[PDB]
Design a protein around this ligand. Structure first.
Ligand code: 65W
Ligand code: 65W
Lengths: 250, 251
């Protein structure tokens, strides 16, 4: 009934707030928008960054660090989705493994506008053109920027995004899953809760449910495109015995 | 009004029939060995291939059929209300990015786990036979079978597919589009039409609408993979001619 759907929605919203550092609502206030309580430090050039083992590699590695960190926040959020911990533990691991990249790029949009991205929990702001100003690394944020511009045109808020992220985790078509049935049964429930949420939250945005789902197609293409860049960078340099243990962590 | 959505659904179903020679309904009647009205001849090896008469031959068959399919899809496209009224450059762009996604959607209608109908249903070519084709060509069809088997478990019929196919063409998040808003206004209507159609045609089937739209992710991947395998073929087969139309669509 509408009752357990709204219950599910509020549950997810509550744990999404608890699990992640900067909400979209706060990121929007910082960006383009209102509140400049404390302006973020802006990174627009090589100087700016320093004023903030090596620049272009420094920045791409920094994004990896945050993303490893984010995997744990996503994990904790996953385990708050009703039914998730009851799944086969191999399937939990699989769902997280193939889901975290799509989740990261989804949420990255919350931190982006067409001009740049908030980092360090909104304390910083790296400009889009400074990012594109790199060498075989000026290639890696631009498709995220192009995706975010289109995705943010849907004007979702955190309550919408909480359910959407849960939908992504409970996919069903991840390779190697052992028991697809309960996963799809949970996702069917989450899709219902999502549909309702979007109808109550955006009553005059017609077919917002459908439009948001079609965005999954662009999301997977981003992820695919990102892993192939990663494979190229794994041909920039791999041999060095000065962070073997840090290499491990990533 | 739901009434307007029903008329649009009827209209699109109607054009689909008139545009596409072999419907899913006919494909299923052929495939199910309980209607012996006219059974297909089955191609499962090279001698049955020669009885029912290599890899290049088969794939250029596929190439010619695809170009004709583009024609039929193009014909169907003009019947979608609002489509011919769009900026022409966008009409080209919509077709360019839509055509292959639709071909693999419809291809599934002619497939089961064991093979695919060919030559307007007169032939059936085995999945194993296609998989054993020489090294580059043996990998072309297998991901389409994979898609088709899970897509076919949605159990869509032609009146469903007519609207879904229209939804695909009228995307708008396609690259290079000049006027996105009028494209999205039309898709928005196709989507309402699709949503109603599935809930009436499949009352017991929970969130079929969402699960169908998720399938759009899979069609993208198929196209992407097929493209990268075509550029392999282009280099190992310098003597094989890719069709100019198909060439213009791929970039
Ligand atoms: C889950 C998410 C979106 O994870 C992020 C991952 C990477 C970045 C990021 C993106 C681009 C450059 C960066 C440089 C240093 C640190 C982080 C980045 C921002 C957020 C977040 O922090 O909300
Ligand atoms: C739109 C569609 C799906 O177009 C087709 C495209 C390719 C094939 C096909 C697929 C695989 C092998 C073939 C060999 C000879 C001729 C055609 C094929 C069948 C149909 C159709 O005819 O319904």
């Amino acid at each position: 009934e509408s009752a357990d759907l709204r219950a599910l929605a509020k549950h997810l919203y509550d744990s999404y707030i608890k699990s992640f550092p900067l909400t979209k609502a706060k990121a929007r206030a910082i960006l383009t928008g209102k509140t400049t309580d404390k302006s973020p430090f802006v990174i627009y050039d090589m100087n700016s960054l320093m004023m903030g083992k090596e620049v272009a590699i420094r920045i791409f590695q920094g994004c990896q660090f945050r993303s490893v960190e984010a995997v744990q926040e996503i994990t904790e959020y996953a385990k708050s989705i009703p039914g998730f911990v009851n799944l086969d533990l191999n399937d939990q691991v699989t769902l997280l493994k193939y889901g975290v990249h799509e989740i990261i790029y989804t949420m990255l949009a919350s931190l982006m506008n067409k001009d740049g991205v908030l980092i360090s929990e909104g304390q910083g702001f790296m400009t889009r053109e400074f990012l594109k100003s790199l060498k075989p690394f000026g290639d890696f944020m631009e498709p995220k920027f192009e995706f975010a511009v289109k995705f943010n045109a849907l004007e979702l808020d955190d309550s919408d995004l909480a359910i959407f992220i849960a939908v992504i985790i409970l996919s069903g078509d991840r390779p190697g899953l052992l028991n697809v049935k309960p996963i799809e049964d949970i996702q069917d429930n989450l899709l219902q809760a999502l549909e309702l949420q979007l109808k109550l939250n955006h009553p005059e945005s017609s077919q917002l449910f459908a439009k948001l789902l079609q965005k999954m197609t662009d999301l997977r293409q981003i992820v695919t495109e990102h892993v192939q860049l990663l494979q190229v960078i794994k041909k920039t340099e791999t041999d060095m015995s000065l962070h073997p243990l840090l290499q491990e962590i990533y």
